[PDB]
C-alpha cells in the first residue's frame, strides 16, 4: 500500500463528529465536568472503531491492541481536540455543543492549568499550519508508538504510518531542509500533547476518586486500566 492510500485509510477510519446533546447554557463546575466526562466516554467508543480500521491493527494480538489503547486514549482524545480547535483561536472545541474558554476552566480547580496547556499547544500547530493529513498520521502514530510475532507487525505498522507522514510533508513541495525541519517540529509537539494528557488523566482520576463526576463504564475501565 502506497503512503497516499494508507493516509486514505486513516481518513476513512476517522470517527464521526460527536455531540453531547446539550442545550446552550452557561457552564458551572458540575455541568462542565459532567459534560467533559460524558463526551470522553462517547469518544472512547468511537476511538476503538477507529483503531480497528487502521490497516493491520486487528492483526495484532488482542493483548497488544488492548495495551496500546489503554495507554494512549487520553492523548488521542486531546490530539483530536487540538485539530478541532485549530481554526478557533482562544477556544477549545471539545464538541460543537461543548466549546470552552480559558476563563471558564477557572471554576474548576486544576483545570485552567490544563486548558492553558491545550490552548498553547493548539496555537503551536496553528503556527505550523498543521494539515489534515498530517493530523491523521500523527494521531495514528500516537496510538502505535505507545508501546511502553505481534511485536514485528506493530513495528511494521508504525513504520508504515511514519512513512506516510514523511510522504504528506514531501507533497507540500517545500525544500528538503524545510521538510526535515517540519517533520521534527511536528513530532516534538507530541511531547507537549502527551504532557497535557498525563495532567488530564491525573485530573480525571482525582475527580473519579471523589465521585464528583459520573464515571461511565467504558471511561472508568480505560481510566483504571491506564493508571494501573
Amino acid at each position: 500500500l502506497s503512503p497516499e492510500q494508507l493516509v486514505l485509510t486513516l481518513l476513512e477510519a476517522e470517527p464521526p463528529h460527536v455531540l453531547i446533546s446539550r442545550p446552550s447554557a452557561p457552564f458551572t463546575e458540575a455541568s462542565m465536568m459532567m459534560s467533559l466526562t460524558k463526551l470522553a466516554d462517547k469518544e472512547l467508543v468511537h476511538m476503538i472503531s477507529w483503531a480497528k480500521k487502521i490497516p493491520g491493527f486487528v492483526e495484532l494480538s488482542l493483548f497488544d491492541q488492548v495495551r496500546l489503547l489503554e495507554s494512549c486514549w487520553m492523548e488521542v482524545l486531546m490530539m483530536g481536540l487540538m485539530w478541532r480547535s485549530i481554526d478557533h483561536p482562544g477556544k477549545l472545541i471539545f464538541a460543537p455543543d461543548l466549546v470552552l474558554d480559558r476563563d471558564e476552566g477557572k471554576c474548576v480547580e486544576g483545570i485552567l492549568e490544563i486548558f492553558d496547556m491545550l490552548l498553547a499547544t493548539t496555537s503551536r500547530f496553528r503556527e505550523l499550519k498543521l494539515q489534515h493529513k498530517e493530523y491523521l498520521c500523527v494521531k495514528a502514530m500516537i496510538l502505535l508508538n505507545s508501546s511502553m510475532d505481534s511485536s514485528r507487525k506493530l513495528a511494521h505498522l508504525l513504520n508504515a504510518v511514519t512513512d506516510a507522514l514523511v510522504w504528506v510533508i514531501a507533497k507540500s513541495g517545500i525544500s528538503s531542509q524545510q521538510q526535515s525541519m517540519r517533520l521534527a517540529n511536528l513530532l516534538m509537539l507530541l511531547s507537549h500533547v502527551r504532557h497535557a494528557s498525563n495532567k488530564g488523566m491525573e485530573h480525571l482520576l482525582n475527580m473519579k476518586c471523589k465521585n464528583v463526576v459520573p464515571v461511565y463504564d467504558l471511561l472508568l475501565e480505560m481510566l483504571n486500566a491506564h493508571v494501573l
Binding site: 476503538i48 486487528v58 488492548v66 489503547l69 475501565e221 486500566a225
Partner: peptide, 10 residues
C-alpha cells in the same frame, strides 16, 4: 472486559 468486547464486535 468492555474495551475487549468492542475490540471483538462490529
Amino acid at each position: 472486559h468492555k474495551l475487549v468486547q468492542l475490540l471483538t464486535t462490529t
